[PDB]
Amino acid sequence: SDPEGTGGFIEPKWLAYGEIINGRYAMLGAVGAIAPEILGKAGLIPQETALPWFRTGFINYWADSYTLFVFEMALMGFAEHRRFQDWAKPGSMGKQYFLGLEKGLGGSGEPAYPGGPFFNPLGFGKDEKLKEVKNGRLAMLAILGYFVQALVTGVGPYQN
Amino acid sequence: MRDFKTYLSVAPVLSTLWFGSLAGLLIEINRFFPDALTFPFF
Amino acid sequence: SDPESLRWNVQAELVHSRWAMLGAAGIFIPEFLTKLGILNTPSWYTAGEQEYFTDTTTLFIVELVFIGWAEGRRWADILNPGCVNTDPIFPNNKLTGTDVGYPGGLWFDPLGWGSASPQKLKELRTKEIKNGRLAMLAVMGAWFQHIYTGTGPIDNLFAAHLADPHATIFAAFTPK
Amino acid sequence: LVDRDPIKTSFEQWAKPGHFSRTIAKGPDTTTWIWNLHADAHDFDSHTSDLEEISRKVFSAHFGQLSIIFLWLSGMYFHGARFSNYEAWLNDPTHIGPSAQVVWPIVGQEILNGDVGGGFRGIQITSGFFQIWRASGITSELQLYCTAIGALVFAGLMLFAGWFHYHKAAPKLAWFQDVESMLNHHLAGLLGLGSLSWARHQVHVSLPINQFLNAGVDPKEIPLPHEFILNRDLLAQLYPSFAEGATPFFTLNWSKYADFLTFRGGLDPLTGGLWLTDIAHHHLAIAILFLIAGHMYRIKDILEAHKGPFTGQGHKGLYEILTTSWHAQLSINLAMLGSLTIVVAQHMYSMPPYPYLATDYATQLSLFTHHMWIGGFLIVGAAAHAAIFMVRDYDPTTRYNDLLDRVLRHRDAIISHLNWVCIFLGFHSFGLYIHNDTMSALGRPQDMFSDTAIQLQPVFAQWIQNTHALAPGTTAPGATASTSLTWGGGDLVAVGNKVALLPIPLGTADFLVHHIHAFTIHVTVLILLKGVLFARSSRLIPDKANLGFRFPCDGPGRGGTCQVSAWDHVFLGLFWMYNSISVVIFHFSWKMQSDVWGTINDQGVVTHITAGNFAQSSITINGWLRDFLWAQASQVIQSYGSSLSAYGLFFLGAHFVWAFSLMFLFSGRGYWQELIESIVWAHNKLKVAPATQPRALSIVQGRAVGVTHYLLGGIATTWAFFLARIIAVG
Amino acid sequence: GVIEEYLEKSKTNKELNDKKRLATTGANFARAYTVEFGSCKFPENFTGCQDLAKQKKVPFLSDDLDLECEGKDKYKCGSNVFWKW
């Protein structure tokens, strides 16, 4: 049958709750701070013809370049909509191998978190003494947002 | 899929894919012979 | 809410398909086959290098006198006898319909079990790779595109141009 | 209908004769219903007796206009791009004479394609892109080629919002049937946030990128594709980066400035398109309002309020049903939208807002008559649709005893006056001219009405024009010139190719056209006014809202009983307005060229396209084909074998099509029946006719194929007459 | 077409060609096939001597990445004594 797409007060919000959750670790720059020593800046159009920003940043880059940028975001977007179909369910994913009884070996199950199950029961001594895990990382997202253009330039920190 | 004794229908103005085109192929004879006013024959 | 949307010949589109596509067979394996460096070389002197040309458009005539003949015989007795008038059995005819062809005339028929059944088993074979051939050739007919567009130097036409790195065309692989 | 209603078929209705009132298109065959179907296709007395949907259709099948205006414009930006002449024309204006369209040399074609400027074959333009396009804080041909697809973007999308309505299971009542906010929004931030946003991309980028164009260069010897960011360093030439001010307010010092704006008025010597150093300030100074303004409000309250003695008790309550009409809240609009378009048509020609207009004569009068026929074609409408109200829209009579029930109370009255108004005019408003003929052809000028014989004396001046160009000495601040250079007082020096605007003098031959307009504007309106007013009931027919606002004519009795109705008042009211506009046009160019347009050289001895021939000689209404129609038009009937030629070559057709209208306008109906059978007979003998009962035209269809033709005839006639006497000298 | 010898004598050839030193690109920044440079170590303004300079040095530039971090200085504001002038 024809594919589905139910709107209803607030799908737009479940997938809109989700969009920012992904963007909260695609926040990247300060979540994984080792990520950019200077990688937040993409480094457009600075040909051995010419130039970057403008006075920039200039004492954008060496680089990790290239092409094959569309093929990625498309091809691995050709997976985002599969853990969205496959586990509609009727399970058989573990096609195993025709012969061989020696395949008890499992791996996990369906995972969310420390894995197959949680696992290794046995725990607490010290470590010690649903959306807040969402809310605070747009309070990390939209923050670099203005920090791209984060300048007064002609002048600077009035505050100071 | 269409054999013998009339066939399937078509719209209000398929005449607008009959004025435009067919007829349209005819400018296509009015540049192959970019000219008329009598005509050689075959 | 879902298109309305069609068919019915929904039954026939599927048999210029096995036409188009099986067919692309002819181009797919013979090309690449070609035979890299056979030993080698492609040279065709024979009827061809001295008798004032060989073909092009006597090419077609002879060439598809046959295709002529055979492509016609192909769909227009695929099957369908009864072969005239006058009330509906749909395809846009089956105005063959309830009669196949003949009431006790000859051996219209192939094969016992009062039908034409080329027996029950063989979904196998041609469901798979073949309406493959439909699919396959979609993408190495999308290679036809890649394989040559770019009109190897020898012409920029309507000059945008519009930038410049380096060339393109075919033989297999890719810089990457 | 009836078909499957239910619940029980996605299976769409393709096949089974008819739909549209109920002994419908009947099994039994006919033709009338094929003009039915297209006509009244949009309507509402059928589809359903229940509002609901309709507003759910009109908010969709609306949409596909924007999207369209959007597929359109694209093929115009593309067009105004790679079919170039814009690049070529801009380094080289005063010089060029622009194109966008070009044939392909099939058959006769090519004659139409005739050297236009930056070195190429094509057909000209009187549609001032290439001049909005001055704008391009950037320039580049492939660029417009982005603005272009940027267009097709808005479209497909601003056209899948129309899937994303009606066809999608729709909003409802409240959504519009709560009106409470609508203009709140609209005027505040778009009306505002455009004009606003337009400010930001109207000094940022445009001002500078023609601040130093108004001199020379060849583009990309100027205005990069990014260049205009943070770099507030070239914004250095065109005022401070605020230097020491912070977000206006006052603790600011000017020992030498006052931000961009520094208000102009007049006209760039080198590009008299009015100054841009202003154009930001005025759009800014708009938006604010809208920005403040769209912040009402929530409705009745304000109209439920001020009444009086004779005033409007029903003022109070002026329509619950103004959330429950459309046909009403469309007709109101058209009067404004419409009447608020031809106010463009002036402020344009006596105050150009684009670089290179006036000098560009033909590329802003086309305008001033295109814009001019909407500020009229939209007004008769703005009446029609009120008639459509006045007859039907509401369910019952719940609306009662008010401003209207009032106006109607008098009605053989408001239109009783207005009438005499017109015959007072007409006699003072046209036979006025006819005097002249009868007495200038009699010939005794002593006694004409000349700008010089009947007592008026070498001055017009002392009125209000002369207190306009001179007002920069009131509460007025100032800024060299006026507001509109065409005013009485001071200044001359305007432009170095040809001319632009200068005073524009008056008296008589300006006095009386100005009055024919009155009488023309008035008797137009009489017929629409009385038309829409007497919509539903009368003492010629009271049983007279009983079908719809059309209906052919009630019937041979009562004497006449034909025209009546109000489709038809909106049929003979078009008939006038075609004049209303068609003679106002006739006015402007005969002025604007008899005086104004003309030209400088040494000692700027001015040389109008015509040494004011107007003078003593429009006053004669023959002078109007001595000096007009037979004078100019000599360019239409010379126009063969050229490049424009498509005008002269129209000017015969369409000057034919009109003279085909009368046949549709002037004739019976069981006539072409009585005829259509003789035909139908000869048809049957060969066995070739009956199926689909061929039928003559639906009394009022017939009038539909009058009128519409009479206009697309009688109109493009001049559309040709014009473009052919501004292209080429003028 | 029509062939005489031999689709070639000597086959297709130098049109992709790179071979002994397939170099260009991987190489060029054959300054820096090894962005090798200076000292090791250390004292100061390195960046030679071509390159140069040090322009404003310490943490700056070098960043680059100069290195390191120092009990400075320490950039942050106020100073450099904005020594201009």
Ligand code: CLA
């Ligand atoms: C905001 C405005 C706008 C809108 C949305 C509407 C909407 C409507 N009008 Mg309306 N109207 C308008 C402005 C508008 N009007 C104006 C300005 C006028 C004054 C002329 C009118 C005069 C008018 C009348 C008299 C009627 C309507 C009616 C209607 C309704 C019928 C619609 C229909 O079937 O299309 C009608 C369109 C056609 C059938 C297409 C034919 C168009 C022809 C004449 C071509 C025009 C010439 C052009 C140059 C030809 C193309 C080029 C060619 C040479 C290749 C509909 C609700 C009708 C009704 O009965 O109410 C329910 C009634 O007929 N209108």
Ligand SMILES: CC(=CC=C/C(C)=C/C=C/C=C(C)/C=C/C=C(C)/C=C/C1=C(C)CCCC1(C)C)/C=C/C1=C(C)CCCC1(C)C
């Ligand atoms: C300049 C160049 C380049 C390149 C390269 C390249 C470069 C290539 C390209 C390719 C392309 C492709 C593959 C595609 C693309 C597309 C695009 C880019 C687009 C974009 C856009 C925009 C911009 C916006 C809108 C959207 C779009 C998408 C349209 C070069 C340079 C140089 C120098 C210095 C010297 C010599 C050497 C070299 C090294 C050479």
Ligand SMILES: CC(=CC=C/C(C)=C/C=C/C=C(C)/C=C/C=C(C)/C=C/C1=C(C)CCCC1(C)C)/C=C/C1=C(C)CCCC1(C)C
């Ligand atoms: C979304 C937006 C916007 C905008 C802006 C806008 C939204 C603008 C607009 C404007 C508009 C305009 C500007 C209009 C125009 C119009 C036109 C142009 C038309 C014209 C015409 C006429 C005159 C009539 C008819 C015809 C035509 C059409 C031609 C934004 C938003 C936002 C948000 C939330 C977030 C943050 C940022 C912001 C920003 C705050």
Ligand SMILES: CC(=CC=C/C(C)=C/C=C/C=C(C)\C=C\C=C(C)\C=C\C1=C(C)CCCC1(C)C)/C=C/C1=C(C)CCCC1(C)C
């Ligand atoms: C005879 C004819 C034609 C004529 C024609 C004429 C003799 C005329 C016509 C006219 C048309 C028209 C005319 C249309 C149109 C149009 C337009 C496009 C318009 C536009 C405009 C506008 C926009 C608005 C207003 C202004 C104007 C008008 C400018 C034809 C005939 C024929 C024959 C033989 C047979 C077959 C068919 C044919 C081939 C057809």
Ligand SMILES: CCCCCCCCCCCCO[C@H]1O[C@H](CO)[C@@H](O[C@H]2O[C@H](CO)[C@@H](O)[C@H](O)[C@H]2O)[C@H](O)[C@H]1O
């Ligand atoms: C057309 C019917 C005449 C009735 C109106 C005449 C009253 C005013 C006199 C002429 C009006 C036109 O105004 C025109 O005057 C002069 C022509 O003499 C021109 O004079 C211009 O040329 C010279 C060049 O430096 C100098 O004399 C002036 O500095 C300069 O303004 C101007 O380009 C224009 O300002």
Ligand SMILES: CCCCCCCCCCCCO[C@H]1O[C@H](CO)[C@@H](O[C@H]2O[C@H](CO)[C@@H](O)[C@H](O)[C@H]2O)[C@H](O)[C@H]1O
């Ligand atoms: C958070 C993980 C790294 C540091 C967290 C734990 C304390 C940090 C170690 C400090 C080591 C001794 O003191 C140190 O404190 C800070 C944290 O390293 C350093 O912070 C450093 O981080 C910057 C990162 O670009 C560098 O420019 C400098 O080396 C310095 O700014 C001090 O400049 C350093 O002198």
Ligand SMILES: CC1=C(C/C=C(\C)CCC[C@H](C)CCC[C@@H](C)CCCC(C)C)C(=O)c2ccccc2C1=O
């Ligand atoms: C001339 C005239 C007619 C006769 C006009 C007619 C019959 C015009 C209708 C002719 C139609 C449009 C011809 C349609 C035929 C073609 C569409 C069929 C072939 C399809 C094409 C491929 C040609 C009236 O019916 C009429 C009615 C009321 C008042 C005045 C008049 C009036 O003045």
Ligand SMILES: OC[C@H]1O[C@](CO)(O[C@H]2O[C@H](CO)[C@@H](O)[C@H](O)[C@H]2O)[C@@H](O)[C@@H]1O
């Ligand atoms: O093995 C990965 C590769 O990337 C590393 C991780 O190994 O880290 C940076 O370098 C790559 C280039 O290889 C960058 O694209 C990557 O995204 C960076 O984090 C580097 O050490 C390795 O070369």
